[PDB]
Ligand SMILES: C=C(/N=C/c1c(COP(=O)(O)O)cnc(C)c1O)C(=O)O
Ligand SMILES: C=C(/N=C/c1c(COP(=O)(O)O)cnc(C)c1O)C(=O)O
């Protein structure tokens with residue numbers, strides 16, 4: 063209808079990560095990194111034009127209007143109320159994760175993640191010389207679940223100081239229930255663990271699934287937990303480089319901001335600020351339209367794979383626009399899977415093994431593209447699977 | 450038919466640092482932070498419109514065209530030849546300084562600066578729990594000069610591991626001679642010091658003074674020295690957030706890039722990349738024209754202050770568009786000077802004391818604005834100085 067979800071803008075010649083390989087091999091169709099193929103909402107494009115027409119591109123600060131936009135988005139969309147002083151802007155969520163690790167732990171101390179998970183989680187812990195504790199998620203009835211007995215064991219046995227939670231969880235697209243988050247929080251309270259809730263996918267919950275922001279679970283959770291999010295995944299504006307932490311606890315907030323300044327990682331670009339404010343101000347109708355398209359694409363993929371590759375195990379996302387595929391029933395190695403998809407099927411999917419050992423013989427599929435493209439990508443995925 | 454240096458775009462609705470106080474108090478005229486009031490070169494404005502017209506604002510990386518533009522600028526403007534692989538982009542120079550401190554020293558080790566100097570120098574050392582060694586610049590015949598005897602004493606007595614050099618030096622605008630840089634480099638070789646040369650103002654040398662980029666002084670200097678620079682100060686694009694380190698030594702380069710990744714400080718915004726490439730590709734004629742305006746503004750200020758405030762000691766910049774003013778002959782304290790300028794004169798100048806103890810009773814004046822505004826600011830500065 064009014065917004066364009068039919069035709070993908072041509073990204074070749076714009077130095078995108080997503081289309082980089084395709085620029086050398088034109089047959090390759092990318093469906094990996096979490097950028098969407100869709101045109102961004104028109105108000106953001108207009109805001110970039112308006113930025114140009116400032117004529118001067120000097121140092122700018124985070125305005126009260128931007129702060130209010132974040133406050134209003136969190137309250138309106140996620141029922142999460144806090145003060146403007148609790149917002150800390152950071153040029154990205156992955157930046158924020160390293161700052162959090164450096165601020166809240168010392169070298170050698172243990173940081174826990176639920177594996178398999180977005181690879182910068184494990185990387186950021188290891189490169190910072192913290193001890194990584196991978197709490198392996200169970201898979202039951204096609205969904206990831208937390209083994210709470212082993213999670214406590216992992217916390218206690220390793221003296222875990224910090225828990226990097228992914229909510230919604232990437233990969234898999236798991237939209238944790240309030241009851242799950244409450245159990246996590248109680249464990250953090252018991253064992254004196256600080257929790258960082260990476261909620262970057264929070265606006266992308268689907269099929270009736272509702273995001274529960276971590277500190278909305280219990281009024282005391284802010285004593286040990288902070289929330290990271292952004293407009294970038296929601297609105298396909300990852301190249302504008304802005305995001306935020308909500309840190310209501312004064313001590314945690316000071317410690318984060320201090321580390322951020324120690325790292326000189328405290329400034330954001332002018333368009334970073336503009337694009338986030340604009341997206342939150344005008345983006346809701348576009349987001350509604352987006353989510354309908356994503357649901358149709360996911361449903362199509364699940365049904366198509368059921369019909370054309372019944373042996374392929376498909377985890378239906380509860381949120382995110384990313385589908386976790388399990389090729390374990392096929393007579394392939396992890397490396398042979400990669401070369402089959404990339405070289406024979408000519409489709410670029412994230413290698414599941416990037417996400418941890420649980421990702422062996424998996425791949426991750428990005429369906430945030432026009433339906434015609436999603437149909438082509440799914441056709442390629444089933445085309446060359448071995449008997 | 451000509452570049453505009455006659456009128457300044459209105460900044461008041463655009464959340465600039467420079468005009469922030471004036472938004473609340475319309476009587477105040479800013480001349481502090483190093484943003485220019487001048488319109489940016491027209492090709493950058495067009496590049497921002499062109500970015501808007503990509504329609505999708507996803508993750509991008511530094512292109513070969515951008516890398517070549519930096520290489521070409523460094524060779525043509527500064528006679529500094531190196532390879533594309535030696536370039537490391539960082540969202541800002543101040544970011545790069547923290548990364549360098551973290552990468553090249555251990556907690557508790559000594560880092561040297563020449564004081565007084567841009568305040569993030571001292572701050573980045575101190576906040577990083579390194580020992581700060583301030584090598585105090587002499588002032589002789591209106592110019593800063595290094596005391597090489599004391600500099601060596603400072604290096605040896607404190608076991609200095611890292612030297613943060615400012616060239617051109619801010620404040621004061623001192624354009625160090627080749628022979629001065631030679632002697633600095635030789636001390637670093639003798640005492641096994643790593644040197645970071647902050648050359649962000651390298652394109653703004655004036656009155657026939659020529660920038661000498663540090664690693665051009667001797668082919669050996671790359672073994673211990675790296676250069677930081679940017680398009681942002683040269684072209685008035687600080688809000689676009691991109692800059693680079695040139696690190697020809699493989700070990701130093703790996704060290705820096707490693708720490709940058711540990712800190713998740715490795716990515717830059719898409720417009721950051723675009724604005725730098727464009728500025729370097731098209732900016733030379735604009736820069737030529739700017740320099741003539743800056744020299745005129747500086748000459749006006751010196752002459753005006755000479756007549757209207759002969760007791761005011763004015764350090765004439767050899768480069769940068771910033772003038773270091775010394776009010777120490779007046780019966781004022783540092784705090785009374787600030788109050789006088791800000792509350793009585795209604796002008797916002799950087800407090801000299803921000804830059805170190807040598808800046809007591811000083812202020813710094815930004816003349817990168819139309820001559821009419823410079824004239825007004827200078828008139829205000831001399832209106833209310835005490836007998
Ligand atoms: C783009 C992807 N993920 C984005 C992501 C990010 C990206 O953050 P920044 O772009 O803001 O650094 C952060 N946290 C989580 C849990 C994420 O899934 C991807 O998996 O391709
Ligand atoms: C804007 C100012 N100085 C800029 C500056 C900067 C600014 O760097 P980034 O904006 O790239 O972080 C870095 N290094 C030196 C020696 C500088 O003088 C000022 O003094 O107001």
Ligand code: NA
Nearest residue numbers: 196418419420
């Ligand atoms: Na594992």
Ligand code: NA
Nearest residue numbers: 583805806807
């Ligand atoms: Na001092």
